[PDB]
Amino acid sequence: MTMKQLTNSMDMMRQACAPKFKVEEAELHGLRKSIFPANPDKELKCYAMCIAQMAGTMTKKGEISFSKTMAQIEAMLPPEMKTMAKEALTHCKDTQTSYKDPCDKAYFSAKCAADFTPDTFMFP
Ligand SMILES: [Fe+2]
Ligand SMILES: [Mg+2]
Numbered sequence: 001m002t003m004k005q006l007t008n009s010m011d012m013m014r015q016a017c018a019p020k021f022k023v024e025e026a027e028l029h030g031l032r033k034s035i036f037p038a039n040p041d042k043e044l045k046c047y048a049m050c051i052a053q054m055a056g057t058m059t060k061k062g063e064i065s066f067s068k069t070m071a072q073i074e075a076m077l078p079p080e081m082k083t084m085a086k087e088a089l090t091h092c093k094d095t096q097t098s099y100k101d102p103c104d105k106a107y108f109s110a111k112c113a114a115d116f117t118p119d120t121f122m123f124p
Pocket of ligand 1: 025028029032
C-alpha cells in the first residue's frame, strides 16, 4: 500500500538478485535514485533483468510484458507512483524492441522510465 512498504519489497528483490551478480551497493542505490548509466556493464543490466523477472513483468522469452506490468502497477504501486508509472509504460513499452539481449531490454526499459519520470520512479 505505502511508499515505506514498497521500499521494503524493493529491498527484498534487491537482496534476492544482487548476490548473483558482480554488483556493489553504490551502483544499486544509484538505480534506486533514478541514476541509470548509459553504458553500464553487463552485470548491472542483467541485475535489472533479474529484478524485472522477480517482479513478474518479464516473459519466459525475456520480453517485458505490457499486461503483466500494468497489472503489477495497479496491484502494488502507491498512488504517488501509479499514474506516472502507467505513463512511463506507454512511453517506454517499445524501448525493448531495439534490443536482442533480455538484460538490455530490461535495463534500458527501466532507464527509459527513470529518465521519463524521475520524480516518481524508484528501482529495486
Ligand atoms: Fe541501497
Ligand atoms: Mg561494475
